[PDB]
């Protein structure tokens, strides 16, 4: 992305812009905590989808694959 | 950029107080990621550590059985 600062053709309006952009920065960061909710579920779902592969890899496969050869011996 | 030449402050104080909660959320994201990138790395490792020795004796006694 590339935002232009063009259009600026020259203290209440200083403090109004310190307000207005931060009435718009609680804003972007309320939107960010709702995106970061998506990151929290993406991380908890990533531990879940690693643990689900450790589950499948150990429980039925690897422990079955071993004791099915010991039972053959 | 080489430049060579209180009401709406109450609205900016109250919204710097709210942007401070929203920076608490974006710094709690940064702490949630700090812990959870350690937690994904502990989960993607702990079956390679603790079970990563017990499953190696479990296998060496199969190699010992043949």
């Amino acid at each position: 992305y590339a935002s232009s600062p063009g259009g600026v053709y020259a203290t209440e309006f200083k403090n109004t812009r310190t307000n207005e952009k931060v009435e718009l920065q609680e804003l972007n960061d309320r939107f960010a905590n709702y995106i970061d909710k998506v990151r929290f579920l993406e991380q908890q779902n990533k531990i879940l989808l690693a643990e689900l592969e450790q589950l499948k890899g150990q429980g039925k496969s690897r422990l079955g694959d071993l004791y099915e050869e010991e039972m053959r011996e | 950029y080489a430049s060579s030449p209180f009401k709406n402050t109450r609205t900016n104080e109250k919204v710097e107080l709210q942007e401070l909660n929203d920076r608490f959320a974006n710094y709690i994201d940064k702490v949630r990621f700090l812990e959870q990138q350690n937690k994904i790395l502990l989960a993607e490792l702990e079956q390679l550590k603790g079970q990563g020795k017990s499953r190696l004796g479990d296998l060496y006694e199969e190699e010992m059985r043949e």
Binding site: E26, D29, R30, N33 | K14, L17, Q18, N21, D22
Partner: peptide, 19 residues
């Protein structure tokens, strides 16, 4: 952030009555 603060609104009314 889902705490658009009530304790700030109760802090305003107190500091406003003190003033």
């Amino acid at each position: 952030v889902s705490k658009p603060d009530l304790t700030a609104a109760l802090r305003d009314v107190r500091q406003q009555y003190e003033s």
